[PDB]
Amino acid sequence: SGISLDNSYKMDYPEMGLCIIINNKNFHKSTGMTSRSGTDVDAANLRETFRNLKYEVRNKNDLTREEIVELMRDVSKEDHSKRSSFVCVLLSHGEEGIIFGTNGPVDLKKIGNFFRGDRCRSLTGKPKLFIIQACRGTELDCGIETHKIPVEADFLYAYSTAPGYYSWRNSKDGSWFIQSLCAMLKQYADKLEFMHILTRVNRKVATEFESFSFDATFHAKKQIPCIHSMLTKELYFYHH
């Protein structure tokens, strides 16, 4: 055949892959964590969005730390040979490097490690996408008026917020980040490479949202998501 190029992930396997959505809304009383009003709007929007991208969506609700770890372990031990990719969405409370099960924290590194190139061989060389709506600390953004591959290769962590910062969720509309992500996937998944879609999500969150609070400490604040890419190829949700 003629000249060939290899700059994008193969996304024409028989299946696009799994999309696991972990939706933690209600937390055990002893943890003192508040209920996350609006997160069901997010989970529903994500399910529809990834359905239209032809992912096999599995929604999970109110998982303990033990259940999260068991779920990730079990999914990583499935045969993904006929799947192009893997997507995991985490909706919960969090801190830097941490997302909360309903009864306590789980290390993000522990979750991701199940899918390492050496530990999940049917996903080696395939994109593994982790989308995270959770806080990364307690900072607020005041804004300004205008042979081998690495075992950690082929991961992308699409974070809702910058390292060290809170992440914002609206109790009626859902989270700023997930709202924006779904809108941009709906509009551009048949048009743009995934990093460029996520850049549009960055712009949407950065420009169109600002917090409203009766508490001066929390009022008029801003948010910028953070793309953490260890991908080695361009990712298009469409093929041919």
Binding site: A134, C135, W168, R169, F218
Partner: peptide, 4 residues
């Protein structure tokens, strides 16, 4: 608006 609430924080996570």
């Amino acid at each position: 608006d609430e924080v996570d």
